[PDB]
């Protein structure tokens, strides 16, 4: 009863010192607290939560593009079939678009109209740095490993943008609004703040139980991956899984640790900004290679490229946790062997590989036909300017094989090997 309910992490920073201070980073990462709330952070770093404020963003940018959710509103603690007879995990919204203008005045009229179905302003792009500087600069004020670049943060050694992971996301609210359950991609942290003038209604169980959580989804008929579902917490409880259970007011931070699951309403009328961060610590890694491999099963894109971003990283950063620095070398040879591999069957197979090298800002690539990270061998077709490119295995499914295929290296395995090497463990 008081294990199946317990209370939440929270933090009181008295003053700007104590948000810099590397207990708040050890108290946050540690693998036993799944979510902490930092009461008073705006506040406590003189951040300009006005700034985004509905009316500062509809000056800004009035004719933005927001994805809006329409649904029906109902208790935080409840998800109702059609008849209304029945508890039920699918959580379905129809999707639609408007404006930020248009967004805001409904949300101004639905709280005058106080003093049933609603929408959900969500996903809302605030990556163009000139149109949101002033937006963006505010955040420098966080410490450093909340900020959305770090040096810290595996997201910043991606090289290229990642919509809504290394950009800042808007979410506008009304009463009612509901992000369903997830885990974050890859299994990243994520931050979250209320700008208010409402409250949100968070929920939150452990990574641990995350596999059980799937099951309820998989029996209910809804996929956990990338279904849209809202968990029935008495069948947590009867299944012995803890649930968090906590309010975030206006100007408090949200710190969703290493895949936990969680889903949020919003109690009255608020926005909230959020975004991920990638702490270099054993733990993140190993959750996010975790989840990068069973996306792989499940045929679900990895929005992260792991293998991209561990060669990035082994490059750049040194590291100094011996139980990160093997799981980061393990992979780095992993891949060397994959490369290999591909190189020799070309080579017995009698097909060429051109070098194509890396370029300034360059994305890392998918595979056209099943979502998988494409590191380094290229298979390229020309669909019609338009090039796609596929994984090996799509490539020889082809028809014709690989008769019209151009095979791409970009890095040489002296290039690996060499970035290998000098990848070593930092006293
Ligand atoms: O405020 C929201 O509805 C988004 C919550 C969330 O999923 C997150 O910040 O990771
Ligand atoms: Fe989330
Ligand atoms: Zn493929």
């Known amino acids: 009863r008081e294990k199946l309910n317990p209370p939440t992490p929270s933090i009181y920073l008295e003053s700007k010192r104590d948000a810099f201070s590397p207990v708040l980073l050890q108290f946050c990462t540690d693998p036993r607290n799944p979510i902490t709330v930092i009461r008073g952070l705006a506040g406590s770093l003189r951040l300009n939560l006005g700034l985004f404020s509905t009316k500062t963003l509809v000056e800004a940018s009035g004719e933005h593009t927001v994805e809006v959710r329409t649904q029906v509103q109902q208790p935080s603690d409840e998800n109702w079939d059609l008849t209304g007879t029945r508890q039920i995990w699918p959580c379905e919204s129809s999707r639609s678009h408007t404006t930020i203008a248009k967004y805001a005045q409904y949300q101004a009229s639905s709280f005058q109209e106080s003093l049933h179905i609603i929408k959900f302003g969500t996903n809302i792009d605030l990556s163009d740095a000139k149109r949101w500087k002033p937006q963006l600069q505010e955040l420098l004020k966080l410490p450093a490993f909340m900020r959305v670049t770090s040096t810290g943060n595996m997201l910043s050694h991606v090289g290229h943008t990642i919509l809504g992971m290394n950009t800042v996301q808007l979410y506008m609210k009304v009463p009612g609004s509901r992000t369903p359950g997830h885990q974050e991609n890859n299994n990243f942290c994520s931050v979250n703040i209320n700008i208010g003038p409402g409250d949100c209604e968070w929920f939150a169980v452990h990574e641990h139980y995350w596999e ?216």
């Open 212 to 427: 059980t959580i799937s099951a309820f989804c998989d029996r209910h008929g809804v996929d956990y991956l990338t279904g849209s579902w809202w968990p029935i917490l008495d069948d947590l409880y009867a299944s012995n899984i803890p649930v968090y259970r906590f309010v975030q007011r206006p100007g408090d931070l949200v710190w969703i640790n290493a895949g936990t699951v969680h889903w949020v309403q919003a109690t009255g009328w608020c926005n909230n900004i959020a975004w991920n961060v990638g702490p270099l610590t054993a733990y993140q890694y190993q959750l996010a290679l975790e989840r990068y491999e069973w996306n792989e099963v499940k045929n679900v894109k990895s929005i992260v490229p792991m293998i991209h971003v561990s060669w990035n990283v082994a490059r750049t950063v040194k590291i100094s946790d011996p139980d990160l620095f093997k799981m980061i070398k393990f992979c780095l040879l992993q891949s060397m062997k994959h490369c290999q591999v591909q190189r020799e069957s070309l080579v017995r197979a009698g097909k060429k590989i051109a070098y194509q090298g890396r370029v300034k800002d360059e994305p890392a690539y998918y595979c056209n036909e099943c979502d998988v990270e494409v590191f380094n061998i290229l298979f390229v077709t020309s669909e019609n300017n338009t090039y796609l490119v596929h994984c090996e295995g799509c490539a020889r499914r082809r028809s014709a094989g690989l008769q019209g295929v151009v095979v791409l290296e970009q890095y040489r395995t002296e290039e690996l090997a060499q970035a290998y090497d000098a990848f070593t463990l930092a006293p």
